[PDB]
Amino acid sequence: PVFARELHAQLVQALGDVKRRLLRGGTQQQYQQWQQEADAIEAGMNIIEKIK
Amino acid sequence: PVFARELHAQLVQALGDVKRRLLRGGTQQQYQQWQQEADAIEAGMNIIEKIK
């Protein structure tokens, strides 16, 4: 539908927030935590793409 | 920061899309798939809340 397309766009914006965060740097600690957040969102994108 | 607060709001909107989707119903197949999407987003909220 046009739904998954709309939820997908939502998650893509969420990745943009993460991606931006990663440009400001931090400890290896912070990087991994944010990469973990990014994985969660990407998992979201995968499910939503495999539903469609 | 005001970052996690902003990424959190993003994910919360994503849940709204899912929640809305679940009101239109479907097979047990579709429900689980969407509940799986919801889990991914909730996992994102958890990480982001445990970073803050």
PDB file of C-alpha atoms in Angstrom:
ATOM      1  CA  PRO A   1       0.000   0.000   0.000  1.00  0.00           C
ATOM      2  CA  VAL A   2       0.881   3.675   0.428  1.00  0.00           C
ATOM      3  CA  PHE A   3       1.138   2.901   4.142  1.00  0.00           C
ATOM      4  CA  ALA A   4       4.428   0.991   4.281  1.00  0.00           C
ATOM      5  CA  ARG A   5       5.688   3.665   1.896  1.00  0.00           C
ATOM      6  CA  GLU A   6       4.735   6.226   4.568  1.00  0.00           C
ATOM      7  CA  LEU A   7       6.178   4.300   7.506  1.00  0.00           C
ATOM      8  CA  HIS A   8       9.335   3.683   5.492  1.00  0.00           C
ATOM      9  CA  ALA A   9       9.768   7.416   4.972  1.00  0.00           C
ATOM     10  CA  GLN A  10       9.359   7.867   8.708  1.00  0.00           C
ATOM     11  CA  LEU A  11      12.157   5.437   9.542  1.00  0.00           C
ATOM     12  CA  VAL A  12      14.385   6.921   6.840  1.00  0.00           C
ATOM     13  CA  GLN A  13      14.081  10.268   8.665  1.00  0.00           C
ATOM     14  CA  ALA A  14      14.963   8.484  11.906  1.00  0.00           C
ATOM     15  CA  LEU A  15      18.172   7.194  10.271  1.00  0.00           C
ATOM     16  CA  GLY A  16      18.967  10.733   9.223  1.00  0.00           C
ATOM     17  CA  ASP A  17      18.884  11.787  12.854  1.00  0.00           C
ATOM     18  CA  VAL A  18      21.246   8.953  13.740  1.00  0.00           C
ATOM     19  CA  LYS A  19      23.497   9.574  10.779  1.00  0.00           C
ATOM     20  CA  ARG A  20      23.731  13.221  11.765  1.00  0.00           C
ATOM     21  CA  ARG A  21      24.546  12.241  15.339  1.00  0.00           C
ATOM     22  CA  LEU A  22      27.435  10.150  14.087  1.00  0.00           C
ATOM     23  CA  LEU A  23      29.127  13.172  12.537  1.00  0.00           C
ATOM     24  CA  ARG A  24      29.638  14.822  15.928  1.00  0.00           C
ATOM     25  CA  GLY A  25      31.692  11.892  17.145  1.00  0.00           C
ATOM     26  CA  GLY A  26      32.166  10.442  20.602  1.00  0.00           C
ATOM     27  CA  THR A  27      33.715   7.485  22.400  1.00  0.00           C
ATOM     28  CA  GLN A  28      33.691   3.987  20.914  1.00  0.00           C
ATOM     29  CA  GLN A  29      30.963   3.546  23.511  1.00  0.00           C
ATOM     30  CA  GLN A  30      28.670   6.192  22.025  1.00  0.00           C
ATOM     31  CA  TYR A  31      29.356   5.056  18.469  1.00  0.00           C
ATOM     32  CA  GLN A  32      28.304   1.475  19.171  1.00  0.00           C
ATOM     33  CA  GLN A  33      25.217   2.628  21.054  1.00  0.00           C
ATOM     34  CA  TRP A  34      24.192   4.740  18.074  1.00  0.00           C
ATOM     35  CA  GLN A  35      25.057   2.016  15.630  1.00  0.00           C
ATOM     36  CA  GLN A  36      22.790  -0.195  17.725  1.00  0.00           C
ATOM     37  CA  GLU A  37      19.986   2.381  17.347  1.00  0.00           C
ATOM     38  CA  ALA A  38      20.655   2.464  13.636  1.00  0.00           C
ATOM     39  CA  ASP A  39      20.410  -1.363  13.496  1.00  0.00           C
ATOM     40  CA  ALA A  40      17.043  -1.266  15.224  1.00  0.00           C
ATOM     41  CA  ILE A  41      15.701   1.240  12.680  1.00  0.00           C
ATOM     42  CA  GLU A  42      17.213  -0.729   9.783  1.00  0.00           C
ATOM     43  CA  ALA A  43      15.539  -3.852  11.128  1.00  0.00           C
ATOM     44  CA  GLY A  44      12.368  -1.811  11.010  1.00  0.00           C
ATOM     45  CA  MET A  45      13.011  -0.954   7.393  1.00  0.00           C
ATOM     46  CA  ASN A  46      13.664  -4.606   6.562  1.00  0.00           C
ATOM     47  CA  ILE A  47      10.462  -5.919   8.068  1.00  0.00           C
ATOM     48  CA  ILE A  48       8.441  -3.161   6.430  1.00  0.00           C
ATOM     49  CA  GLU A  49      10.059  -3.911   3.078  1.00  0.00           C
ATOM     50  CA  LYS A  50       9.424  -7.648   3.439  1.00  0.00           C
ATOM     51  CA  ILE A  51       5.772  -7.058   4.300  1.00  0.00           C
ATOM     52  CA  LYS A  52       5.194  -5.032   1.148  1.00  0.00           C
TER      53      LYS A  52
ATOM     54  CA  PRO B   1      20.377  15.903  25.204  1.00  0.00           C
ATOM     55  CA  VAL B   2      17.513  17.340  23.129  1.00  0.00           C
ATOM     56  CA  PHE B   3      18.597  14.883  20.436  1.00  0.00           C
ATOM     57  CA  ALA B   4      17.351  11.606  21.916  1.00  0.00           C
ATOM     58  CA  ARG B   5      14.207  13.516  22.790  1.00  0.00           C
ATOM     59  CA  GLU B   6      13.887  14.370  19.082  1.00  0.00           C
ATOM     60  CA  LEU B   7      14.714  10.887  17.780  1.00  0.00           C
ATOM     61  CA  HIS B   8      12.271   9.465  20.334  1.00  0.00           C
ATOM     62  CA  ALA B   9       9.463  11.649  18.989  1.00  0.00           C
ATOM     63  CA  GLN B  10      10.342  10.356  15.532  1.00  0.00           C
ATOM     64  CA  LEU B  11       9.953   6.713  16.567  1.00  0.00           C
ATOM     65  CA  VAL B  12       6.779   7.468  18.499  1.00  0.00           C
ATOM     66  CA  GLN B  13       5.303   8.781  15.222  1.00  0.00           C
ATOM     67  CA  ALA B  14       6.389   5.561  13.516  1.00  0.00           C
ATOM     68  CA  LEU B  15       4.467   3.572  16.127  1.00  0.00           C
ATOM     69  CA  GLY B  16       1.470   5.739  15.338  1.00  0.00           C
ATOM     70  CA  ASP B  17       1.648   4.582  11.733  1.00  0.00           C
ATOM     71  CA  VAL B  18       1.833   0.977  12.865  1.00  0.00           C
ATOM     72  CA  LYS B  19      -0.932   1.374  15.419  1.00  0.00           C
ATOM     73  CA  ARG B  20      -3.123   2.919  12.767  1.00  0.00           C
ATOM     74  CA  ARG B  21      -2.378   0.067  10.396  1.00  0.00           C
ATOM     75  CA  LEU B  22      -3.504  -2.450  12.995  1.00  0.00           C
ATOM     76  CA  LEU B  23      -6.989  -0.890  13.076  1.00  0.00           C
ATOM     77  CA  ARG B  24      -7.674  -1.941   9.486  1.00  0.00           C
ATOM     78  CA  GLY B  25      -7.104  -5.590  10.331  1.00  0.00           C
ATOM     79  CA  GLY B  26      -5.871  -8.469   8.245  1.00  0.00           C
ATOM     80  CA  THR B  27      -4.787 -12.083   8.530  1.00  0.00           C
ATOM     81  CA  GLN B  28      -2.906 -13.396  11.567  1.00  0.00           C
ATOM     82  CA  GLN B  29      -0.009 -13.226   9.115  1.00  0.00           C
ATOM     83  CA  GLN B  30      -0.275  -9.467   8.632  1.00  0.00           C
ATOM     84  CA  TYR B  31      -0.831  -8.827  12.335  1.00  0.00           C
ATOM     85  CA  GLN B  32       2.345 -10.626  13.370  1.00  0.00           C
ATOM     86  CA  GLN B  33       4.341  -8.922  10.608  1.00  0.00           C
ATOM     87  CA  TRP B  34       3.170  -5.527  11.895  1.00  0.00           C
ATOM     88  CA  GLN B  35       3.668  -6.492  15.472  1.00  0.00           C
ATOM     89  CA  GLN B  36       7.212  -7.421  14.419  1.00  0.00           C
ATOM     90  CA  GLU B  37       7.638  -3.930  12.956  1.00  0.00           C
ATOM     91  CA  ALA B  38       6.305  -2.505  16.185  1.00  0.00           C
ATOM     92  CA  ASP B  39       8.831  -4.509  18.169  1.00  0.00           C
ATOM     93  CA  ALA B  40      11.704  -3.165  16.098  1.00  0.00           C
ATOM     94  CA  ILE B  41      10.523   0.407  16.712  1.00  0.00           C
ATOM     95  CA  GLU B  42      10.007  -0.254  20.410  1.00  0.00           C
ATOM     96  CA  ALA B  43      13.496  -1.744  20.558  1.00  0.00           C
ATOM     97  CA  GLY B  44      14.690   1.533  19.061  1.00  0.00           C
ATOM     98  CA  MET B  45      12.840   3.469  21.763  1.00  0.00           C
ATOM     99  CA  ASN B  46      14.434   1.257  24.428  1.00  0.00           C
ATOM    100  CA  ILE B  47      17.989   1.784  23.247  1.00  0.00           C
ATOM    101  CA  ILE B  48      17.449   5.522  22.891  1.00  0.00           C
ATOM    102  CA  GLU B  49      15.960   5.701  26.383  1.00  0.00           C
ATOM    103  CA  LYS B  50      18.825   3.678  27.860  1.00  0.00           C
ATOM    104  CA  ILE B  51      21.404   5.926  26.193  1.00  0.00           C
ATOM    105  CA  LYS B  52      19.894   9.069  27.689  1.00  0.00           C
TER     106      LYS B  52
END
